[PDB]
């Protein structure tokens, strides 16, 4: 199974940036996906989560207006659309897989 983040760089404050994630080895359209970032102080925080179909998304209040998680089930890809970022959002962004569609979103990220 492979979850590969990609995209795109280190960018100016107040500007946009799109993050991609390619999945392999499992039915991507069957699982709910999530973004988890690790601050430079090495603390892990939950960033976003999207349903198996790209219809249901939810975030913390700290990122409610800036970030937009999306997914392409035909391409087996996960996206995080960040915009007007501040310096406090500096982090190592991780692409994680949660529970499948036939389970309540139990919120543990195995992969």
């Amino acid at each position: 199974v492979k979850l590969v983040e990609s995209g795109g760089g280190l960018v100016k404050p107040g500007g946009s940036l799109k993050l991609s994630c390619a999945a392999s080895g499992f039915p991507f359209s069957d699982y709910t996906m999530s973004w988890i970032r690790q601050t430079p102080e090495k603390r892990l925080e939950w960033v976003a989560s999207i349903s198996s179909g790209g219809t249901y998304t939810y975030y913390p209040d700290t990122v409610k207006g800036r970030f937009t998680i999306s997914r392409d089930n035909a391409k087996n890809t996960l996206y995080l659309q960040m915009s007007s970022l501040k310096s406090e959002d500096t982090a190592m962004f991780y692409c994680t897989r949660a529970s499948p569609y036939y389970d309540y979103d139990e919120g543990y990220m195995d992969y």
């Binding site: 069957d30 198996s52 179909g53 219809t55 939810y58 569609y101 036939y102 389970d103 309540y104």
Partner: protein, 420 residues
């Protein structure tokens, strides 16, 4: 090009009556019950939703020494029996019987249930019985009838598919043998191969195959040997609506609903299966105990019994009542009832009485003809001047010693005498 039998099989005025005595079979309605013997005094599976396929063997009309040499000459003509009349007798009274399962996969009542809602975690399997769909059918031929059913088809490609995925469904034609299970309202499929649960349908069929006659294939037959007489009459409705427990293999598309406030909520089970029911059984809709006269067949074979045999497929679910016999466990019962002091047994009964009117026929073995018969079945000429059907299980009916020319001595014979 296949040719109608009315062009190369001339008929005579010689008519015979043939009939079995009363045929009956008792057994268990749900499954074969083995009892260690003295092998074996077991009771067989005798269900009202079973195909009854009688293999009726007729006496060789060429070897028959009753007709005189005025009817035919054994130089260019040969004899063959032609079926004209059929009456299928049914014995037991009309009744409705149940088939069930103690661990039926019933999750939630979806037919306006305000009682409660069941949790999927624990073993949510209820003890459920049901009265099956009502079916009366009758097919007469000289070749076993062809039925269709869905089975676990072979792998689509040389492709490794994940365990738990839905297997491919393949429609399959098979000869209908005596004892096969009929469509009961859950479809015509291989429940043993397509349901590893062993809990979706009652015990009658949970490990069996339900076959439905392929009327489309038998009617499009070239020669029409499979079926030259067919009577169907079936009815069913949905009595109760239920839910199936188990993880949904097909993801419910999120375009078709709105999840509500709990945006991380698992959608409830959306695999709905109704309980079938055959509604009222009435003698007005009865289809047997009646004489049926075959004049024109549906196919080109017009009721000609090649190889002096005749296959009769019949299903009658209008007598599905089940006898409940119970015996006390004490030698004599103490006059106090406790369920532990009584053994309960379920037995089912089937009773038939087959009657036939056959017509003797000549076949002038010309050229063009006979070569046509050779292209039809070489074994026809071979038997005149092994068995491929012994691989299948039939109910044997030997009528070689049961033919009689005194038609007025038998009920079907008299009813046939009202046809001059």
């Amino acid at each position: 090009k296949v040719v109608s039998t009315d062009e190369y099989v001339t008929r005579t005025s010689i008519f015979y009556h043939a009939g079995s005595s009363r045929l009956l079979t008792v057994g268990h309605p749900y499954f074969k019950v083995p009892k260690g013997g003295n092998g074996r005094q077991d009771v067989p599976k005798v269900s009202a939703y079973q195909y009854r396929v009688f293999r009726v063997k007729l006496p060789d009309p060429n070897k028959f020494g009753l007709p005189d040499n005025t009817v035919y000459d054994p130089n260019s003509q040969r004899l063959v029996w032609a079926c004209v009349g059929v009456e299928i007798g049914r014995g037991q009274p009309l009744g409705v019987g149940l088939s069930g399962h103690p661990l039926y996969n019933k999750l939630d009542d979806t037919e306006n249930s305000h009682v409660a809602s069941a949790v999927d975690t624990k073993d949510t399997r209820d003890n459920v019985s049901v009265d099956y769909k009502q079916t009366q059918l009758c097919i007469i031929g000289c070749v076993p009838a062809i039925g269709e059913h869905w089975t676990k088809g072979t792998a689509s490609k040389p492709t490794t598919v994940v365990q738990g995925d839905c297997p491919p469904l393949e429609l399959i034609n098979t000869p209908i043998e005596d004892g096969d299970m009929v469509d009961t309202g859950y479809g015509a499929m291989d429940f043993k191969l397509l349901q590893d649960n062993k809990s979706e349908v009652p015990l009658d069929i949970c490990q069996s195959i339900c076959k439905y006659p392929d009327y489309l294939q038998m009617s499009a037959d070239a020669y029409g040997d499979s079926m030259f007489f067919c009577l169907r009459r079936e009815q069913v409705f949905a009595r109760h609506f239920w839910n199936r427990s188990g993880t949904m293999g097909d993801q419910l598309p999120e375009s078709l609903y709105i999840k509500g406030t709990d945006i991380r909520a698992n959608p409830g089970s959306y695999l709905y299966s109704p309980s079938p029911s055959g509604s009222v059984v009435t003698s007005d809709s009865q289809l047997f105990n009646k004489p049926y006269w075959l004049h024109k067949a549906q196919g080109l074979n017009n009721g000609i019994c090649w190889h002096n045999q005749l296959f009769l497929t019949v299903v009658d679910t209008t007598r599905s009542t089940n006898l409940s016999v119970c015996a006390s466990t004490t030698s004599s019962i103490p006059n106090v009832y406790t369920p532990t002091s009584f053994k309960e047994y379920a037995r089912h009964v089937e009773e038939f009485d087959l009657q036939f009117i056959f017509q003797l026929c000549k076949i002038t073995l010309t050229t063009e003809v006979m070569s046509y018969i050779h292209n039809m079945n070489t074994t026809i000429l071979e038997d005149w001047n092994q068995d491929p059907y012994d691989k299948l299980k039939f109910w044997p009916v030997d009528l070689k010693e049961r033919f009689s020319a005194d038609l007025d001595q038998f009920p079907l014979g008299r009813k046939f005498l009202l046809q001059l």
